[PDB]
Amino acid sequence: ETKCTLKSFTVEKGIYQTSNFRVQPTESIVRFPNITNLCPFDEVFNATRFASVYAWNRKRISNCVADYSVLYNFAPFFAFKCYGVSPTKLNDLCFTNVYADSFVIRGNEVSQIAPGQTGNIADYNYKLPDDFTGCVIAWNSNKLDSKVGGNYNYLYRLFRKSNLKPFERDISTEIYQAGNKPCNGVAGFNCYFPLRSYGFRPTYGVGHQPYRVVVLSFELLHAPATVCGPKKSTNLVKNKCVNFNFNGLTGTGVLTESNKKFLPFQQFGRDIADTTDAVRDPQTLEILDITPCSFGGVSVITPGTNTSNQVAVLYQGVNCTEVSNVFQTRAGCLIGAEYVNNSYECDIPIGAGICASYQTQSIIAYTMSLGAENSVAYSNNSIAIPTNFTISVTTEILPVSMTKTSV
Amino acid sequence: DCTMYICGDSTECSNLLLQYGSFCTQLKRALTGIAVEQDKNTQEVFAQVKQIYKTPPIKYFGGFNFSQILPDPSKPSKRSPIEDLLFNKVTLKFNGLTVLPPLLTDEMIAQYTSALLAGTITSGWTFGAGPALQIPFPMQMAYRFNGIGVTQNVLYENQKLIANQFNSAIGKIQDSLSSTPSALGKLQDVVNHNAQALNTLVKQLSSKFGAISSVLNDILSRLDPPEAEVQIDRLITGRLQSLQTYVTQQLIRAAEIRASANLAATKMSECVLGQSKRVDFCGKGYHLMSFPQSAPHGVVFLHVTYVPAQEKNFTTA
Amino acid sequence: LSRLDPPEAEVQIDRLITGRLQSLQTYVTQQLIRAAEIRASANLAATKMSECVLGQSKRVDFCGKGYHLMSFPQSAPHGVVFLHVTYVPAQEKNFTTAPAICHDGKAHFPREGVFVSNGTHWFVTQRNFYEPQIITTDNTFVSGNCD
Amino acid sequence: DCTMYICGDSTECSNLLLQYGSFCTQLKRALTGIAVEQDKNTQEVFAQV
Amino acid sequence: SYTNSFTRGVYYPDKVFRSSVLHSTQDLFLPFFSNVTWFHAIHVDNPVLPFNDGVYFASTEKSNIIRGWIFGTTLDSKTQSLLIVNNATNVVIKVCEFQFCNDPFLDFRVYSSANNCTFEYVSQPFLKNLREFVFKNIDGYFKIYSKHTPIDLPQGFSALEPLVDLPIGINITRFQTLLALHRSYLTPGDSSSGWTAGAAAYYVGYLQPRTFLLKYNENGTITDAVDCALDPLS
Ligand SMILES: *[C@@H]1O[C@H](CO)[C@@H](O)[C@H](O)[C@H]1NC(C)=O
Ligand SMILES: *[C@@H]1O[C@H](CO)[C@@H](O)[C@H](O)[C@H]1NC(C)=O
Ligand SMILES: *[C@@H]1O[C@H](CO)[C@@H](O)[C@H](O)[C@H]1NC(C)=O
Ligand SMILES: *[C@@H]1O[C@H](CO)[C@@H](O)[C@H](O)[C@H]1NC(C)=O
Ligand SMILES: *[C@@H]1O[C@H](CO)[C@@H](O)[C@H](O)[C@H]1NC(C)=O
Ligand SMILES: *[C@@H]1O[C@H](CO)[C@@H](O)[C@H](O)[C@H]1NC(C)=O
Ligand SMILES: *[C@@H]1O[C@H](CO)[C@@H](O)[C@H](O)[C@H]1NC(C)=O
Ligand SMILES: *[C@@H]1O[C@H](CO)[C@@H](O)[C@H](O)[C@H]1NC(C)=O
Ligand SMILES: *[C@@H]1O[C@H](CO)[C@@H](O)[C@H](O)[C@H]1NC(C)=O
Ligand SMILES: *[C@@H]1O[C@H](CO)[C@@H](O)[C@H](O)[C@H]1NC(C)=O
């Protein structure tokens, strides 16, 4: 690695930095609140009785969790079709309005509830837009919406002057003028009533049994998308650097226990350097500190390929408790060398007053010696007078000029 | 870390970072060169002596008092009261920014300072020009007074007065260094500059440099990969420029520190390890001797000066 | 300029020029810093040449470690090597020292050197070489009594 | 002054300039430091007496 | 009348924690030493109150004097307006499109003629009894900050803590207070219902985009905040 970093084959003696040590996260936990609200789908699917098709009700949902889990409500659906939105991908989408329309029609009339259809229910009772984005759920309800004597409680409009607009509701009961005179508002020849009854019976055929059909209208009006389904629910890893996604706040690190108290409304937390070091868990009220795990830099201490090939590793600025004689110093932690107790001359600088060398055998590590020890006898009546002279030569090399270059 | 500071735990960001060139292997190289150069300036001034000298047990040099400059064996850290006072006044891994500790700690520099003090007190100036020669302190002071032209009689007769003046000056050194905290600024402001250099990089990471967001997790989740590549490229360019200007400032400050360290080593060699005839290179006035004291990021020289006073008018021919 | 048309490849050339200018400005800054460093080194070398080769200086370690006597320069393709001749004392010996000598009620002090004693004897010497000489009036001066 | 050198009589330009960061904050600080240092060099040679 | 807001109008700029540090932020704050309007002697006109940069509402009511607030565009037909009513143990916030009179009163129960909306937002009821409120509307969020501190406006320091958020975007340009009395007045045109009651006073102060430097202590509570465009020292 040192040869690749220096781009050579015969490295010299010393310490060289090659790369950095990083601990990869094992898991990735996400924590959101358990539940705040929920769409009342138990009311629009498990009601005691639904309304007619000419007077269909519409319930607005704007402050609830859009949890699409219709599977537990009569899972053997007879007609489960989706328009514009995928069936399974709908659970991970946000919208503006979650208007839900419900009505009861015949078995052979469920096909008319679709974008671009022609018939009595589609044109005179309930019309869907062409570019409709939603889902249509229909299930059999013969046991509930039919009696032996005839369930004439559900009515439908059969005659009307013109077709209904998409998402239009009309409850008018005016006598339809089929002839030339308005009949002055009486029932007679060419004066027919618009609403007709069904009279569901349990002995009817599959095409005539009542089918509770519900329409989930979806639309996006560039709103903050208050409605949203469930996100996730995981545990809390301790003493290990993992990936946290707390309420959109994403990061990687260790979540350790702390003792500082926060405010009831404060959830996040930053230091003076604008670094996220504290975040409140959405599951339970408890603050934890964000501290990174083992992180630093690796350095190879080599005596040079001319002598031998045994090298030593040094992790700088990181404790080596977590992930060959291991020894902890003040400037880092070195492996591959043994700490000697006799101080010699410093050869390879490491830091904090520790230097490595080759004993001649293996890499050593010793506290650098500042020199020898010599204490002169200081006396008020003694002196040291020289006797001999020595003429020595001292070399002092200093650069003068440089390489004149131009581009 | 040129890979971590620009790219935050991202693989494609690191794959795109190598397209700029060899700047990651150049800025880190310049930084480690600055570190090695700073590791050498500490050995050109404090490590001038070859052998460590010690103080004799008899605390009687002739009448002078060196208790405030000699190390005190009572305290755990073997330093002088002046060094302990100076140490209590210098106020001292985030996003891939580490601080490498120096080789020579505060203990080895203290040992070098004590050795230099012992050499300049017991041996005089012979410890810095060859073998150490024993010599009494009053005779060393007589040599230093004769080196500037003053006869040795004024010292061999009026010795108690000079000793009392030196003791009073050593005592008032601490009272003068206690008040006016702006005196120890040259050792702090540069450190403050580090506080304005190591923290200014993380402060600029919150800026989007024109992008939609500052973190990569939002860009790689909101926008599409093919169209968000220009935003990542612009962020990498901005971070590279913000790191290059920091490297340039660090180079300039390292050159300044190198010049200051060369000047300090020259003053240590020409004032502590001998007496110089220069005017104000070893303090204003007539220089006699100099005592060095260590500091976590510098050296304090106390120069003893002989100043004439109480002059009178006379006739000359 | 061959794969894409100039009207559709202008931003690429602009970004290339910007990147190359940014890479060259850093080189220019490094060259300026290194030129300042070399200028300081050359000024120091010229000062040492003037104060060590063209005369003798009283500085301690500016013209070599020890007592400087002379200096010889030697050229090199990118620098200069100064060979400093240093006089170093050695083979020192212990002797007894005294500030002055009180005789005839007067305290005499030496002019050059100090008084060395090796046992029931006293001589005058210098501060750099042992030369025992009898205490005479030429190398001594009276400056009062030993009170 | 970067606010006037980079943006000539423009408010949106000044708003977008702060988005870049604290480049001007350190630039003007270095300029003031250079000014103070040049004001100090005249007192170390002429103001010795 | 007109009073001077010496050192009040500060709130938390974000839901972050800090420990004895300094934060300079450019937000929409109330300028210190500003000339606010004190409507104390107006005991039921001037119903034109803008909502440009927010509302700083200071109250010193004894007990249950104010019944709520209104925030609309023009208070006309087909106008998105939010009415907030604070009862004894319940609070309601309803946004709808309906016309309002000059001074909607409560004692009453039905303000307008018809209110056909299906909005639902229920929270904790809000209402030496100083009560400060800061109302802003930004990024489709109608943010409100409430604080109940003892003691008109003294020289103390008290921040505004965010409690609830409402995602809604409306060009609000109106502001109306809801007074509570005893006598009945069903006529919407007659704007004269002065009755002897406790002290009623609603301060009105407009916010401004300014830069504030706040100091966060070790506990994470705003204890000091200075402006940058009112004094050379600041
Ligand atoms: C979520 O459930 C846990 C376990 O019962 C509970 O401690 C916590 O308070 C719940 N969250 C909220 C917001 O109530
Ligand atoms: C090998 O080469 C290195 C390079 O400087 C040198 O330091 C070392 O002494 C050499 N070893 C031998 C055994 O020649
Ligand atoms: C590293 O961890 C060990 C284990 O507790 C500890 O004894 C040692 O002091 C740590 N090193 C540093 C520099 O804190
Ligand atoms: C140094 O001393 C320690 C403790 O006395 C011992 O554990 C270690 O083995 C010694 N090292 C060597 C190289 O002997
Ligand atoms: C030297 O001074 C210190 C205090 O400055 C004092 O405690 C000590 O006794 C003095 N020693 C002598 C020998 O005067
Ligand atoms: C010498 O005399 C002048 C006036 O003739 C006077 O100003 C000066 O102070 C005198 N010198 C001293 C040392 O008093
Ligand atoms: C002088 O004497 C001391 C001890 O009395 C001794 O350590 C020293 O070596 C002697 N000097 C020489 C030059 O031998
Ligand atoms: C001292 O040195 C002198 C040199 O002139 C010599 O004559 C004398 O004998 C010496 N005395 C002793 C005791 O060595
Ligand atoms: C506030 O404004 C009113 C009228 O706008 C004025 O009468 C009053 O003096 C002002 N108050 C201050 C403190 O300026
Ligand atoms: C009105 O206040 C009463 C308590 O006096 C409370 O029971 C009721 O729910 C409140 N009504 C609304 C709509 O908040």
Would you list the domain boundaries of chain E? Answer: 2-234
Where helices occur in B268-308 by DSSP H, the ranges are: none
Q: CA-CA distance, E97 to E77, in Å (whole number)?
A: 7
Residue with token string 């690749």:
A4
Crossing angle (nearest 10°) for helices B225-267 and C10-48: 10
Calpha distance E16→A278 (Å, rounded):
9
- CB contacts of A396 in chain C (<8 Å) are 48, 64, 81-82, 84
Order of strands across the sheet that contains E122-123: E122-123, E91-97, E80-86, E66-71, E176-179
Q: Which atom from ligand 8 is nearest to the alpha carbon of C120? A: 13
Tell me the C-alpha distance between A106 and A150, whole Å. 14
- Establish if A404 touches chain C: CB-CB under 8 angstroms: no
Which residue lies with its CA nearest to atom 2 of ligand 8?
Answer: C118
Structure-derived torsion over alpha carbons of residues A318, A319, A320, A321, reported in degrees to the nearest 10: -140
Which phi and psi (to 5°) does residue A2 adopt?
-65, -40
Distance (Å, whole) CA A265 – CA A245: 19
Residue pair B237/B245 in contact (Cβ under 8 Å)? The answer is no
Q: Determine, for residues E15 and A260 on separate chains, whether the beta-carbon distance falls below 8 Å.
A: no
Q: Is-contact B97 B204, C-beta < 8 A? A: no
Question: Which residues on E lie below 8 Å from A268 (Cβ)?
Answer: 14-17
**Six-digit token string for B112:** 């070098």
**CA–CA distance, A324 with A301 (Å, rounded to integer):** 13
What DSSP designation does C87 have? E
Q: Are strands B51-52 and A372-373 parallel, antiparallel or unpaired?
A: parallel
SS (H, E, C) chain E: CEEEECCCCCECCCCCCCCCEEEEEEEEECCCCEEEEEECCCCCCCCCCCCCCCEEEEECCCCCCEEEEEECCCCCCCCEEEEEEECCCCEEEEEEECCCCCCCCCCCCCCCCCCCCCCCCEECCCCCCEEEEEEEEECCEEEEEEEEECCCCCCCCCCEEEEEEEECCCCCCCCEEEECCCCCCCCCCCCCCCCCCCCCCEEECCCEEEEEEEEECCCCCEEEEECCCCCCCC
Whole-number Cα distances in Å, E54 to E28, E135, E136, E204: 8, 5, 4, 10
End-to-end Cα separation, chain A, in angstroms: 34
Residue A125 is given by DSSP the state I
Protein residue closest via CA to atom 6 of ligand 2: A306
Write down the experimental method used for this entry: cryo-EM
Candidate of A283, A285, A286 to mutate for ligand 1, largest count of ligand atoms within 8 Å of Cβ? A283
Task: Give the residue among A115, A136, A137, A139 at the shortest CA–CA distance from A127.
Answer: A115
- According to DSSP, residue A72 is labeled G
Sheet order of strands, E21-29 included = E21-29, E208-216, E222-226
Beta carbons within 8 Å of E184's beta carbon, 6+ residues apart:
E107, E108
Question: Which among D20, D26, D48 has CB closest to B200?
Answer: D26
Residues D22, B209: C-beta atoms closer than 8 Å: no
Q: What is the DSSP letter of B184?
A: G
CB atoms within 10 A of CB A378: 20
Resolution for the entry shown, Å: 3.4
Quick one: residue A84, left, alpha or beta (phi over 0 = left, psi -120 to 50 = alpha)? left
Residue nearest to atom 3 of ligand 9 (CA): E2
Give residue numbers after which chain A breaks (C–N above 2.5 Å).
323, 360
Nearest to B134 by CA among B152, B142, B122, B125: B122
Q: Which residues contact B117 (CB under 8 A, 6 or more apart)?
A: B55, B66, B69, B70, B291, B292
Q: Helix B225-267 vs helix B24-41: angle between axes, to the nearest 10 degrees?
A: 20
CA A234 to chain centre: 12
Are the C-beta atoms of residues C70 and C56 closer than 8 Å to each other? yes
Q: Is A94 helix (H, G, I), strand (E, B) or coil?
A: coil
Distance (Å, rounded) from C-alpha A319 to C-alpha A329?
9
DSSP state of A177: E
- Chains contacting C with at least 3 CB pairs below 8 Å? A, B
> How many C-beta atoms lie closer than 10 Å to residue E154's C-beta?
13
How distant, in Å, are the alpha carbons of A19, A194, A301, B237 from that of B27? 14, 85, 22, 14
Q: Nearest-CA neighbor of E40 among E56, E54, E59, E64?
A: E59
CA angle A353, A356, A359 (to 5 degrees): 135
SS3 call for A246:
strand
Rounded alpha-carbon distances, angstroms, from residue A402 to A6, A405, B90, B251, C34:
25, 9, 40, 19, 9
Residues with Cβ within 8 Å of E100's Cβ and at least 6 positions away in sequence, in order, are E70, E72, E75, E81, E111, E112, E176
For chain C, give me the number of helices (H) and strands (E)? 1, 8
What are the residues whose beta carbons fall under 8 Å from the beta carbon of C139, sequence distance 6 or more? C110, C111, C112, C113, C124, C133
Q: Cβ neighbours of residue E211 under 8 Å, at least 6 residues apart?
A: E24, E25, E26, E27, E227, E228, E229
Is there a contact between B170 and B68 (Cβ–Cβ < 8 Å)?
Answer: yes
Look at the block and give the residue holding tokens 């926008």: B223
In sequence order, which residues have a C-beta less than 8 Å from that of residue A167 and are 6 or more positions away?
A127, A128, A129, A217
Distance CA A100, CA A59 (A): 6
Q: Do D26 and B210 touch (CB under 8 A)?
A: no
Tell me if residue B272 falls in helix, strand or coil.
helix
Q: CA A29 to CA A252: how far, in whole Å?
A: 10
Neighbours of A86 (CB within 10 A): 10
Residue B194 backbone dihedrals phi, psi, to 5 degrees: -60, -40
| Residue A194 near residue A176 (C-beta atoms within 8 A) | yes
Euclidean distance between CA atoms D38 and D47, whole angstroms: 14
For residues B80 and B71, give the distance between their C-alpha atoms in angstroms, rounded to a whole number: 4
Tokens 């940069």: give the residue: E53
3-class secondary-structure state, position B88: coil
Looking up tokens 């604008």 gives A274
**Do A219 and A78 meet the contact criterion of CB atoms below 8 Å apart?**
no
Alpha-carbon span A91 to C133, nearest angstrom: 112
Please answer whether residues A176 and A74 qualify as being in contact, where contact means their C-beta atoms are separated by less than 8 angstroms.
Answer: no
Contact predicate A117/A72, CB 8 Å: no
Distance of CA E181 to the CA centre of its chain: 21
Asked if A267 reaches chain E (Cβ–Cβ under 8 Å), the answer is yes
What whole-number distance in Å separates Cα of residue A132 and Cα of residue A124?
A: 18
Integer-rounded Cα radius of gyration of chain C: 33
Helix runs in A40-165, H state only: 41-45, 120
Asked if A396 and C64 come within 8 Å (Cβ–Cβ), the reply is yes
Task: Provide the 8-state DSSP code for D4.
Answer: H
Residue C106: enclosing H or E segment and its boundaries? Answer: strand C106-110
**Chain A residues close to C89, C-beta within 8 Å:** 386, 388-390
Nearest-angstrom CA–CA distance, A229 and A277:
29
Atom from ligand 10 closest to the CA of residue E92: 14
Q: How far apart are CA B238 and CA B209, in angstroms?
A: 6
Q: Which chains touch B (3 or more CB pairs under 8 A)?
A: A, C, D
- Chain Cα centroid distance, residue A57: 37
Ligand 4 site residues, Cβ closer than 6 angstroms: A 338-341
**Cβ(A229)–Cβ(A67) under 8 Å?**
yes
> How far, in Å, CA of E52 to CA of E205, rounded?
11
Chain A neighbours (≥3 Cβ pairs under 8 A) are B, C, E
Q: What span, in angstroms and rounded, lies between the C-alpha atoms of B254 and B40?
A: 12
What stretch of H or E contains A102? strand A100-105
Nearest-CA neighbor of B2 among B98, B134, B109, B89? B98
Cα(E84)–Cα(E86) distance, integer angstroms: 7
Of residues A117, A114, A109, A118, the one with CA closest to residue A134: A114
Q: Which two tokens stand for residue B150?
A: 């003053």
Bridge partners of E132, per DSSP, are: E58, E147
Strands (E), chain D: none
Nearest of E121, E75, E60, E72 to residue E94 by alpha carbon: E121
CATH of domain E2-234: 2.60.120.960
A81 forms bridges with which residues in the sheet? A136
CA atoms lying within 13 Å on the CB side of residue B14: 9
How many CB atoms are located within 10 Å of the residue C133 CB? 13
| Of C63, C87, C66, nearest in space to A398 by CA | C63
SS3 sequence of B21-33 = CCCHHHHHHHHHH
Q: Which amino acid is at E97?
A: E
**Which amino acid does the sequence have at E94?**
K
CB-based contacts of A218: which residues, under 8 Å, 6+ apart?
A84, A85, A95, A97, A98, A133, A134
Query: How does strand C114-117 pair with strand E2-5?
Result: unpaired
The answer, for B203 touching chain D at a CB cutoff of 8 Å, is yes
| Residues after which chain B has a gap (C–N > 2.5 Å) | 92
Measured distance CA(A363)–CA(A359) in Å, rounded: 7
Report the run of H or E that residue A315 belongs to, with start and end.
strand A312-316
